[PDB]
Symmetry: D2
Subunit: 368 residues, 4 copies
């Protein structure tokens, strides 16, 4: 039942992603000394100018200058011409910091969860490739293989699909668009060649690459001193690339900068968890689990499982499976998913869903 | 086939929405003197501090101080204690301004369109009510009826649904959560009473209000000097409340601050247009139109119509209907939808879709 | 030998003075926990926006938000309309903080010292009155006597003089100009009356007030929401009001924000010390002591005493008196003057010289 | 009657001086299109971040981005590593601009004027050399002779004096301290050599250089990426280096950023004028003219001439000479000195007094 789809992703150098990372870096820095630290912060950046805003109630001694500059260094901004230098950039900290199982969900909410068997990660091929494409570039950057590669990058992958008496099977990569920051001493011809052979063909399964697959490598020509500027960088502005690449559903809640007590993060993770668990347990090939919460109430206020006719069990057979295998109460989620651990920074880029190294990405057994 | 859903919206005073409005106000200010002005700007705010960033190639004389302060005044920030005063706030302008039909779509893209017959607006009841709830509060604020009401507000509406051999039929409003900024001289008891009788019951159809409907009015107590701080307001961070309240699909593209040449805005509008037209023409009760574009190419690179079995025509009968009634090329879209007109500021709040006063909300005839 | 002179001073609310105080407040906050803390910071403010910049090598835990907001509170900025509210203003901290007798003067320098017997403080009448005028207003503000009085103020005092076979004897106050911020509910007539009877006549000695003395109270009319704005506030920009009101000599070195190791502060204090000691010891009626330092060298590189023919001893009789009573080496200065003590904030306003509560203002014995 | 003195100066790259220049550049930009433009602005900078603040009532179209960036370019900040790049730095403009002979002096004031015959410029040798030292470095920088030389620099000159039955006669340069920013590829040994032979010895008269003269060239080692940060540059914070190097007297009024209607600038210029005229006319070898003004009154409120016994005429013979040759009323000053002309930027560095290219530096005839 043919149709096509496109998804995108950005590198660690993208202005918005730098803020997402810095905000989560501050979250990590607090969890390490106080796993109960209440973090609610965000970052704004603009050409060698980083603004740390936020309200965080914790009891840990943190050097915000150090945590912000270290994060910028990690990303790869050490030289001047790159558009950012952790040693010289302005780090304005306007942060306010205080000191002092059946909890109850804060704020009426509705979290979504999604999973599909088109890839081993249980995530849309389009977004997975988009992320992996950026990931590979960072590797070649940090390894030395492609020393002209700079932190800021953008990726778009559009794959042609076809349904299957249930749902979504990828056929081939229609076109790929990738833009990456770079050093001056490197020709546009050499860049485009390296992007096709060393990054694209090294991550995209042969099955999907074609003789007609369209490539748009460095379309707008040069991207040298670009760096993290883009008029301004902000936290929580890359909501779709942090999730499913526009495939599931999204209520609009941002992750980065918020601790484990905010249902926007935790419950979203939990919802992905059960979704991934369901397909992994063969109970379906594609699911859209919807978990609703009521302010004050701990136990979820109605969970809905949405298979696209890919399950043999039947919605409200699968719901009982979820109700017998999962306890989606906020407090239980953080305990089961180990959400007090400082893993949030690595979650701040290349997507929150898909990577197996995260608790919520480890499928639960599911006793049926 | 019961399930519940929740959606949210924010008032004109919400930090993020102030930026969305200011950014669009600058867009309007340029279109009025140069309908071909290239606008790409964004705003950041934080307690009496507004930062205007951006790159805009236009040929019009604009007083940015005037357009920013006027927008803040319009929102209702004239006094000190409200958390913003257009006469005293810092307006830092770091704006860079230059001077000098079958076009061709910029940037690989994938826009979504959605519509459902559950309301006359052809939008999800949950998001419509959420928006209208905030709209009414602004009316009572500007009329004088509720003079304690202040600009910043947040709304959440969760409605219980049930499918119907096709899709989505609202049954009742399960719970409503509304928080609004206010003046000191007004009791929490009087506020909650006014919110239920004068705002909620004056906008929510009797059919949906129940004896069990849950109300959470000013849940966190007092919201007085809670003016635009919310730890830094930003542009394009309220992506879901600007669209379908998490019902359709969203690629992640922001509207506010971008002119009509960016497919992220125009094409998204066009997609809504055809979606609304389809259901209005009785061709379906619920649609998810998906329009894809290829960088460089003008004509859309594959459009997909997604009915949920609510159409009698059959996808790839409806596609021809769309291909015979619509010309979704970027240039044609702006011409047909009159996208060079300065209506963008009023689009910057209370949702981009739903309100009939916008070109894209006027259903096209559809000759079949 | 008639001539006239004018001097000025500003209140604790003056933008520049707020920065001078905040900068010194941060200095105090460090000295209390590490008397060897190396402080080099400055502040910038602009309508509810305070920027703390600086490089400080210390080993003490300080809450910059607390030290900045507390200083703003102390000044009297607690309400909105006053142009500053310590509870709501933006405190952007871009501060960088590290951790780890015959010293030797840093930076080639030339410090000046001045003293005259026209007042018991051994300071020019013009500047003393100018300071006292502002001081009294703060008292009436903090006591409650004049509750309409606000933090920002400016004072100018011009006195008619006459020489005396030596130097400078004040005759009468020619004119007084005073401007002070205020609340709305207070008439311009009532303000001007209170300024003349309760502030001016309560501080200016009867001997100097005349029937011709000119008064300019609130000349520019109203000064309500003025507050600390004045387009921006800065540290070290009120160099003359911090010293002698334009009577001695000034090399241009700023005090506030610099610790006791900077000769610009310490040596300047030391120079005032000896000047005050000389006149107090009857060795002269007016002196301008000039102390020069050489980078690297500890012992002062030539000290010059400048009496205006008011001494009977004779320059280079008085120099030996100074060389036999004083050891102006940097390290000795800080030890003798107890410069590691946190008294710098109270030094940040109403003048550094004159007030007896400071070590350098306590005359040394002088054995001759 | 031996004594020593020291004075300092800073290059066009010094943070404070960059602000002084930018502020005056904006003043020039307005005068060129509206000689009656009311300018009152100031600048703040900090590592690739320039903030333009101010209130200016004028009727001229100015591109503040252009005037700020052009000024930074002129100074020599075009590359990244230099600590500033006019093409990449953040120029935040928070400027507010409106549109619409016997005047009367604004604000009670007291301006000082000074001149001495120790140099042809009629300025203290110490400050003249200090300025010229920096000037030469800029020449070698802009010529190409010393291509490693960067914009930021600081200079200190201490000369040994001796009185003369009147006053001040320089004997020799005791020590010279000079620090200048530089490129990486240049040894500390080569820099110090070039500073002594090509800059110092090329500007300092042989008569003053000695075999004992102490040189401190690049004392603190390397000053590479020491670009404009110096923990925030500001306008009007270099008050003494803009005048007499601590030789005359200074009330504390800043020049840069203020138009010709502010007595702080105009009258100060006028006072220098008469001082220079007096010594040039042989009426004295050293003068300290003191001009006082009364708010509202046009004609100066008492002018005092202070010779140090270097005149044969006698104070109150010289006063009549001044009263018969000069009309120091504000309006007349601007007319006679051509103060509506855009020469203020070149006045913003290397000193306001001394250079003959300025109107006030051209001695008036003086008919006696
Ligand atoms: N910086 C932009 C592209 C550069 C080349 O203009 C980006 O995010 O891809
Ligand atoms: N704020 C100015 C005066 C006010 C009345 O215009 C001052 O520093 O005196
Ligand atoms: K945007
Ligand atoms: K968002
Ligand atoms: K100034
Ligand atoms: K100064
Ligand atoms: Mg993107
Ligand atoms: Mg492109
Ligand atoms: Mg970019
Ligand atoms: Mg002053
Ligand atoms: Mg006045
Ligand atoms: Mg003021």
């Amino acid at each position: 039942g043919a149709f096509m789809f496109t998804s995108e992703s950005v590198g660690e150098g993208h202005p918005d992603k730098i803020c997402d990372q810095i905000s989560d870096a501050v979250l990590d820095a607090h969890l390490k000394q106080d796993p109960n630290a209440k973090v609610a912060c965000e970052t704004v950046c603009k050409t060698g100018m980083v603004l740390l805003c936020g309200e965080i109630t914790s009891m840990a001694m943190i050097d915000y200058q150090r945590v912000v500059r270290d994060t910028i260094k990690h990303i790869g901004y050490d030289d001047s011409a790159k558009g950012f230098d952790f040693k010289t950039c302005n780090v304005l900290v306007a942060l306010e910091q205080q000191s002092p199982e059946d909890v109850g969900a804060g704020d009426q909410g509705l979290m979504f969860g999604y999973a599909t068997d088109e890839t081993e990660e249980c995530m849309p091929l389009t977004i997975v490739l988009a992320h992996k494409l950026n990931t590979r570039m960072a590797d070649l950057r940090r390894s030395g293989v492609l020393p002209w590669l700079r932190p800021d990058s953008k990726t778009q992958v559009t794959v042609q699909y076809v349904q299957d008496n249930g749902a979504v099977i990828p056929v081939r990569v229609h076109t790929i668009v990738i833009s990456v920051q770079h050093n001056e001493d490197i020709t546009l011809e050499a860049m485009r060649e390296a992007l096709k052979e060393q990054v694209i063909k090294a991550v995209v399964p042969a099955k999907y690459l074609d003789e007609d697959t369209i490539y748009h490598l460095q379309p707008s020509g040069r991207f040298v001193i670009g760096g993290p500027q883009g008029d301004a960088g902000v936290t929580g502005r890359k909501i779709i690339v942090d999730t499913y690449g526009g495939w599931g559903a999204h209520g609009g809640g941002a992750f980065s900068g918020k601790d484990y007590t905010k249902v926007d993060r935790s419950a979203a993770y939990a919802a992905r968890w059960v979704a991934k668990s369901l397909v992994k347990a063969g109970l379906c090939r594609r699911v859209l689990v919807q978990v609703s919460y009521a302010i004050g109430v701990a136990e979820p206020l109605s969970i809905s499982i949405f298979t696209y006719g890919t399950s043999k069990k039947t919605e409200r057979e699968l719901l009982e499976v979820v109700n017998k295998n999962f306890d989606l109460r906020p407090g239980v989620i953080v305990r089961d998913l180990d959400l007090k651990k400082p893993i949030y920074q690595k979650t701040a880029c290349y997507g929150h869903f898909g990577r197996s190294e995260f608790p919520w990405e480890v499928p639960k057994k599911l006793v049926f």
